[PDB]
Design a protein around this ligand. Sequence first.
Ligand SMILES: N#Cc1ccc(O)cc1F
Length: 178
Amino acid sequence: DHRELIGDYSKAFLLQTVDGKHQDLKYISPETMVALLTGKFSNIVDKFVIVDCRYPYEYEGGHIKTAVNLPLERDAESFLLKSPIAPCSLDKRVILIFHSEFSSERGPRMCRFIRERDRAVNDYPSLYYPEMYILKGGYKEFFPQHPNFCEPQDYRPMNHEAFKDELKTFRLKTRSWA
Ligand SMILES: N#Cc1ccc(O)cc1F
């Protein structure tokens, strides 16, 4: 493999990656996301979690099948790290995939946060989630490519004109803002 090792330096990244703006994070294409969902890697990948970092109204308007909605850092931390999601075989992998609407801000932010927390609760260099990816282009790019991998088959942007109140309501539940 022509890249660096995963975060606990145990092995190479399994998935092919594409360029993304956060140069130190690994991005995957919609096609690769589908390869996971269709079990192309089932001999090796025991579990993968799709972490939809968008707000609940966005998720409710259409999300990737099997995805979990964890927009608040405190909830992502509880869900992922209170009782870590472990493979059922020592030989097999657990992978996290983070995304948001464009995977420009919210997805990458959550990915970095989880790494920070994972490091904090382990003896270096061990990690619960050494292998994490960002879905390039987020839900906005995924839905038009693979609508039957989504439910409902629709797309509700964060800035949807009918959801301005819902955006504000959610923001007021966050731990920090500028
Ligand atoms: N932060 C962070 C972080 C998350 C995943 C990764 O592969 C590398 C990183 F620096």
